Automatic annotation (TrEMBL), chain F:
Protein name: Tetratricopeptide repeat protein 29
Top-rank taxon, per record: Eukaryota
TPR repeat spans: 40-73
Function in brief: Axonemal protein which is implicated in axonemal and/or peri-axonemal structure assembly and regulates flagellum assembly and beating and therefore sperm motility.
Section of the entire sequence shown: 315 to 437 of 471
Amino acid sequence: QLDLKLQQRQARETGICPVRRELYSQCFDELIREVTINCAERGLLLLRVRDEIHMTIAAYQTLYESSVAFGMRKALQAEQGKSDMERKITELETEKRDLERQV
Amino acid sequence: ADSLLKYDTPVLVAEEILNAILPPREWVEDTQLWIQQVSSTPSTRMDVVHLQEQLDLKLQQRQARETGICPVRRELYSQCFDELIREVTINCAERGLLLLRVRDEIHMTIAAYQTLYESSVAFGMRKALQAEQGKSDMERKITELETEKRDLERQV
Amino acid sequence: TALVCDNGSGLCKAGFAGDDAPRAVFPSIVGRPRHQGVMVGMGQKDSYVGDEAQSKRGILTLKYPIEHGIITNWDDMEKIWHHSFYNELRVAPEEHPTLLTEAPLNPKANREKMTQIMFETFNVPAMYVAIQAVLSLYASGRTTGIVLDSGDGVTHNVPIYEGYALPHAIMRLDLAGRDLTDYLMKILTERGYSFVTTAEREIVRDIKEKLCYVALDFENEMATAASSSSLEKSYELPDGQVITIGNERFRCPETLFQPSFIGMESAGIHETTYNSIMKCDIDIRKDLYANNVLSGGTTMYPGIADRMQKEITALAPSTMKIKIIAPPERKYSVWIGGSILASLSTFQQMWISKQEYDEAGPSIVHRKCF
Amino acid sequence: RLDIEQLLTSEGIDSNKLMPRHPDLQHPQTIEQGRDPLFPIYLPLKVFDNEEFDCRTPTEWL
Amino acid sequence: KRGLVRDEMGMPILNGGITPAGRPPLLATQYWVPRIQLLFCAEDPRVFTQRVVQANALRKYTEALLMYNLYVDCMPTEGRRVINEQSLSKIKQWALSTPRMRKGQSVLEHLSCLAREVNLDYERSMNKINFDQIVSSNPETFSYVTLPEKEEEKVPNQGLVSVPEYPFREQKEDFTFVSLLTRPE
Amino acid sequence: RAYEAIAKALQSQGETTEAINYLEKFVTIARNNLQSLDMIRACTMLGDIYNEKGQYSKASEYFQQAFSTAMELMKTALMDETKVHYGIARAHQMMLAMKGYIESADSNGLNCLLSWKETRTQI
């Protein structure tokens, strides 16, 4: 059923993917059900791993969005510097052009 | 060399499934190799309780940072997951196959997330530094145009 | 692994090479938050881009990047690419050769600039350029073809022969989906529905996708529409008002054949394509008549294939088998072509690449590329 | 026949509240104070004013 | 008072009031205003109400949310400096790598500054997830503080867009078969 | 324990001024007898009270003491909580100026905001 789903959804086999995450999640949970029915403890510790994984990926996602905030902030700073460059450029090149041609 | 969870009896010089889920770890000294097995030990629910105790013991003992990322904590949980896959597989190969398969896939998924972050910040400073080179080219433009203003002063 | 990104001006498409469909599609729009101090306070990202920008279209500023098929601002287009790679594709751009596409006859400087920005800022080791019609013919699967292409901001005809474009026979016509939406808006205003706001205009676009179709014998179709209500087709607006459209459904498409309805004087698309093949050489004219292929959004209209078949045959000498082909996915087909093209291993040998990129650098997109 | 004043008050907003103010450095509102925000308006509402709802462009209005 | 908008010369102020010589000054009770300031009698007060209250809500929510971020941005974490060395070295190598950049000592200095800044950002983000966990856990103890936003995703039912069936493999094969591009010479 | 319960029951009823007095007694005993875990906790409640009252300097002092003592104790959850409160108090101070900069919405105001974000420091 996993392979059927992956084909029929046409999963992205690698990288990030919603389809893969959700499908792997459901089959993981099903096997946790099987384990628990065989032994509660084994499945409970599997659940603890499930939590640690889930919060870890959430943490990395937050770190990524912080990366995006870095990117925007520093881009905006440097492009404001580029605006100061354009500001000086317009006067500088106007003076260059008129002074040269008038000379 | 060492590994803190149920690698079995180093030899100094299902079983197919027990290798496949988890290669029996190796280290070599002075050309003499220790190969440490994944035994077919059909570990028990009580062993599960003992693992739980010993793992939380390790976790507090190092004081692995809990909330958010922590390499030590994540590695400890990886050890737990490795023992869990061993236990299932020794119970049934197929169940262990699916468990290990998902373990691998999620491990690659976290690896991808890290790679993404790394490259995204790479873009971020690569913009910052490209713009800083652009500012260096501003420095060039102003300095050379100042020399051209000296040239214009000479031309007047 | 490889990436393909494409812009028929109207909407832009992002996909992993060799896939039978792109992994995301999103509209060719960028928007910056109107108070930069608030944005830096939030850390909310530089711009909304893609559809969520539409969701916020009123709350912020919005701007288009590729008008008449040509780059209006580089910095916006690179923001598009950034959003595409991270939000849609997630991959590190540094790790995946990437394909970007352009309208034909792009002024030479734009090719170089585009290359420079991709290679230096986005940091992929290798990248390639293609002219949209060329990829759409690849999707059709011929080296030997005359393409009709119409993404909602422009339209062109392009002869391509054994995989090269004979430049002089290319023509531009500045009559595309936007213009069609505006003409439709005008004539519905004459009916009294009076769409003007951006939201309404989008509704007009939806009506174009839902209910337009070409006439065959236009004057006969128009007469029959006048004769009877039976041609009517009704639609209900999002607000639950019902609107009713007759002749206008085919009349709006006529503007393509009949640009005098727009008050522009170059002859209709069929004529332009004939005149292009007339610029091409009798040696290759037969195969051009053999492979007429339709590309881009405007081809969405039902039946246009037959109308072109008739009108071309009339304008042509009646001495060839004219063959229109309208490959079902023709608007996506531009991107589909690129996906298969990049899939071709030898194109890895075509790759322009960092080592060359130092010395051979910006000029080789002129010199090496096609 | 509609009155905006009664609608806006029925949503709960005194229009006079909407305008940005200088902070009363005399008596900066502590969170105990029980105002809805931590502090009244300061970001200009014009930032958030969204053209999504308008039926006509300014040029159309003219 | 009558409803008689006129200039002080009694001209009902046309757009001509922007005189051929130019705009007059402000006349006392003239104003420049944003759209939210005003409605036109031709538009539905209901909608104007909805958008006005929406704007108010959005602005309050936003300025509170940014103050949330400022609270956690102030978080005095400096005593923790946990930064992954391999990651840093890798992103540095990425940072230099392929472009034309002259990579003079000024570059190395800036790179060090940026590294320190991203290290701060790194622990900042950690403190963010700590903060969010804490506020989730004990809301009443600091209920004045907002949460951040919460958002969702729904798996696109196929990871590829709809594009009805066509002989994609056959088209690709045909393209490879006909084309001359299979030959680097 | 009684002083703590009293303080909570006062705060339950907004009698917080008296709760300050009982908290000060409790902190005095716990500090002098070195019940530092509870001393930290009580100091936290004191800081919270001054924070809602508005004495952000006082609150920041209480949080600084509580955090430093916990750091001696290394009880990580206490570290997190004291960090949160200390950050909030500092932020309540800092926001007056940063809000000013944000509203000024200008080349200087933005350069201040960016300078702070990078430095975490003022001009």
